[PDB]
Amino acid sequence: TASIDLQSVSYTDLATQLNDVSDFGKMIILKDNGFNRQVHVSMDKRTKIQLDNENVRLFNGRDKDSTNFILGDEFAVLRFYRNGESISYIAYKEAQMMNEIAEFYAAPFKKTRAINEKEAFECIYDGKYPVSVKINVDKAKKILNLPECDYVPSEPKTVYVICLRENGSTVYPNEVSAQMQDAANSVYAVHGLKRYVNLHFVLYTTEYACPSGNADEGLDGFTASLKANPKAEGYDDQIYFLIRWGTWDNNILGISWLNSYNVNTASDFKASGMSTTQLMYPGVMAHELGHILGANHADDPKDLMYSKYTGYLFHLSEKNMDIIAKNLGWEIADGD
Amino acid sequence: VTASIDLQSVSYTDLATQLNDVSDFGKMIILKDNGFNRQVHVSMDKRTKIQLDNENVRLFNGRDKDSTNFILGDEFAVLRFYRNGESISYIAYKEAQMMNEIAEFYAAPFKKTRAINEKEAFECIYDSRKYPVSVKINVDKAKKILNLPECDYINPSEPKTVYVICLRENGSTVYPNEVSAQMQDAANSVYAVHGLKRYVNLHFVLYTTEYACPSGNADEGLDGFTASLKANPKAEGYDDQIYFLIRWGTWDNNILGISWLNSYNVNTASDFKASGMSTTQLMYPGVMAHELGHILGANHADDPKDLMYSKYTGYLFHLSEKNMDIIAKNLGWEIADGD
Ligand SMILES: C[C@@H]1CCc2cc(F)cc3c(=O)c(C(=O)O)cn1c23
Numbered sequence: 001t002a003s004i005d006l007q008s009v010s011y012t013d014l015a016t017q018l019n020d021v022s023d024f025g026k027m028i029i030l031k032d033n034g035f036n037r038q039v040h041v042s043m044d045k046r047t048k049i050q051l052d053n054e055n056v057r058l059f060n061g062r063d064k065d066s067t068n069f070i071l072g073d074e075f076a077v078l079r080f081y082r083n084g085e086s087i088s089y090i091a092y093k094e095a096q097m098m099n100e101i102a103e104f105y106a107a108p109f110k111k112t113r114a115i116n117e118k119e120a121f122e123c124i125y126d127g128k129y130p131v132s133v134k135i136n137v138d139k140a141k142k143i144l145n146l147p148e149c150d151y152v153p154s155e156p157k158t159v160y161v162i163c164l165r166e167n168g169s170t171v172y173p174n175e176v177s178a179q180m181q182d183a184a185n186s187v188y189a190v191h192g193l194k195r196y197v198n199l200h201f202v203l204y205t206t207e208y209a210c211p212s213g214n215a216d217e218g219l220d221g222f223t224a225s226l227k228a229n230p231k232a233e234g235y236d237d238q239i240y241f242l243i244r245w246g247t248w249d250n251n252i253l254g255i256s257w258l259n260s261y262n263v264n265t266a267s268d269f270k271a272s273g274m275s276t277t278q279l280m281y282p283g284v285m286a287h288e289l290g291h292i293l294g295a296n297h298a299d300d301p302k303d304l305m306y307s308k309y310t311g312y313l314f315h316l317s318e319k320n321m322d323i324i325a326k327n328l329g330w331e332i333a334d335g336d
Numbered sequence: 337v338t339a340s341i342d343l344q345s346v347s348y349t350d351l352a353t354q355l356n357d358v359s360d361f362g363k364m365i366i367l368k369d370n371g372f373n374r375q376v377h378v379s380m381d382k383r384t385k386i387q388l389d390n391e392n393v394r395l396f397n398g399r400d401k402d403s404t405n406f407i408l409g410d411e412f413a414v415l416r417f418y419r420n421g422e423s424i425s426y427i428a429y430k431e432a433q434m435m436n437e438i439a440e441f442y443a444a445p446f447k448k449t450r451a452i453n454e455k456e457a458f459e460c461i462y463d464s465r466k467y468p469v470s471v472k473i474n475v476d477k478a479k480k481i482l483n484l485p486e487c488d489y490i491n492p493s494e495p496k497t498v499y500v501i502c503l504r505e506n507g508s509t510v511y512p513n514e515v516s517a518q519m520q521d522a523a524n525s526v527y528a529v530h531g532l533k534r535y536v537n538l539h540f541v542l543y544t545t546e547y548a549c550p551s552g553n554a555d556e557g558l559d560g561f562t563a564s565l566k567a568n569p570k571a572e573g574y575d576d577q578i579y580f581l582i583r584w585g586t587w588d589n590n591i592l593g594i595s596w597l598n599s600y601n602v603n604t605a606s607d608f609k610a611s612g613m614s615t616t617q618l619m620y621p622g623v624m625a626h627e628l629g630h631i632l633g634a635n636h637a638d639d640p641k642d643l644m645y646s647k648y649t650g651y652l653f654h655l656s657e658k659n660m661d662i663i664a665k666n667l668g669w670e671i672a673d674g675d
Pocket residue numbers: 002016017020499501541574577
């Protein structure tokens with residue numbers, strides 16, 4: 001009976017429905033031009049997120065629903081798939097911020113003028129100012145013709161993922177949260193790893209900025225900045241990401257220290273990386289987190305760890321899944 | 337190695353980073369101050385939900401022997417604990433402008449009446465390494481320093497979700513730390529009785545209403561409020577929930593609140609009958625809990641330490657077995673179910 005109308009979905013519509021999701025879950029109907037999708041929504045109790053101390057909650061549908069939600073005080077996201085394409089509904093609470101976000105996402109499409117712009121990008125009203133935006137990331141990338149971007153314990157162990165907003169960079173909370181949600185879900189999807197780890201993401205600003213466009217030099221400087229940062233004292237065994245909106249030289253989406261995190265030996269800020277957070281490249285943080293957990297490049301073009309950027313968000317390599325799970329305390333005898 | 341909160345410099349960031357680290361299994365946190373120490377086992381309150389104008393507010397509990405509660409929103413944090421029978425709150429707002437405004441708001445009643453030991457009742461807390469990072473208020477000591485007038489009252493497999501819809505009266509200003517403290521105390525007064533968390537989970541929401549009491553009279557004010565709910569198009573389909581009109585202040589004759597007695601039953605709730613009005617000011621904790629008590633059928637108790645005592649006392653729990661049975665039965669409980 002509860003429902004979300006995709007022709008007029010606002011922050012208030014998403015917040016009132018998601019805030020009613022109790023421990024037992026709730027059925028919510030997604031309604032789109034007379035066609036409906038019933039989703040069983042549950043609170044994500046494994047991942048915690050703060051962005052500059054602002055609490056962000058995640059929600060999951062069933063496996064067959066391929067639907068996830070994000071909810072903060074300032075914004076809400078609905079993300080699902082249609083013909084394998086990623087579709088996001090992004091809604092900001094404040095009128096000024098929603099207007100700014102709608103202009104930010106509309107601007108690239110105004111440079112070009114595609115006849116099918118509505119299916120890739122659309123401002124949603126309900127009607128002078130928009131209440132949300134709809135973006136089909138797969139369709140948007142083909143219209144914009146962007147450059148080709150390249151690359152058992154009784155309680156689970158809490159692992160912090162400390163994300164640091166690069167000096168001078170602007171990141172958008174819906175985009176950063178989507179990267180974090182996809183990264184955490186890429187780990188829990190492997191060998192029942194929610195039994196071993198619960199990921200806690202935090203976002204702060206750092207004084208560090210990459211000294212050039214080079215990703216390799218940038219990561220050397222970032223890891224060195226962590227060792228000299230007085231705020232990071234006592235946290236050398238956590239996972240770190242330098243984040244920005246943009247990419248590095250040669251359209252590199254991110255970079256990280258391979259096989260640098262193990263639950264028993266983590267130290268000296270070794271488990272560090274850098275990642276873009278822009279909406280058009282989902283799964284970059286997930287790919288770099290996989291690399292930090294020991295995953296190598298995979299040969300399946302549908303693998304999250306494929307050498308080229310693909311848009312796929314899950315580990316498919318059995319060798320990588322075993323390496324990642326073993327680094328988080330799992331053993332074959334434990335099962336899935 | 338044990339996590340700790342230094343009450344001589346406690347800020348919003350200190351409280352948020354500690355409370356955001358509380359997982360499903362709980363966490364030990366040491367509360368420290370000059371001549372004071374308390375180890376508390378903190379847990380997330382998974383029974384109560386709160387939105388204030390759609391802003392999510394989370395509650396945290398200590399063990400019964402810890403006598404400690406917390407509140408955490410994106411904009412503010414509260415630590416409240418009892419020490420030598422006195423309620424002490426540490427209130428910290430995230431934004432510097434809002435923290436400065438809140439510190440001035442709480443300091444203003446004291447500046448008029450300069451008492452010798454004002455520090456034990458009210459104190460602006462500053463960072464150790466200048467604007468305040470939090471305020472400390474001992475309500476019991478504050479009442480003895482201030483010349484306040486005597487405010488009183490008029491002489492299942494899954495729990496059921498019950499919404500408590502609080503409406504900010506037109507022309508009133510309420511503070512989020514104050515409203516949340518009233519809601520937390522009200523919900524905890526219910527769960528403390530007959531294991532009622534098995535039957536009900538309270539979900540508080542706060543919106544603004546166009547309604548304003550036509551006079552200072554509480555009886556007339558409640559008549560108008562219940563009538564405004566029946567005429568409110570936003571309330572259509574929600575006549576079986578619980579409602580409160582809230583303000584900062586009090587009504588005529590220093591009346592703290594008012595409500596329709598025995599107006600909520602999980603099986604027959606309807607026509608906006610389960611409605612009341614409540615002050616939310618910090619100096620009168622438990623007013624919403626007392627009015628929610630009346631709506632659930634609790635009568636005046638004779639013990640001066642009961643939440644339901646006819647006069648305002650500051651106590652936050654039902655002690656009357658007769659009232660506890662009436663309240664629990666109205667929420668679906670039976671004696672055979674046990675506690
Ligand atoms: C989830 C839905 C919309 C938001 C909402 C706000 C509120 F104050 C009360 C209710 C509410 O009472 C409800 C229900 O059917 O029990 C459903 N919702 C509510």
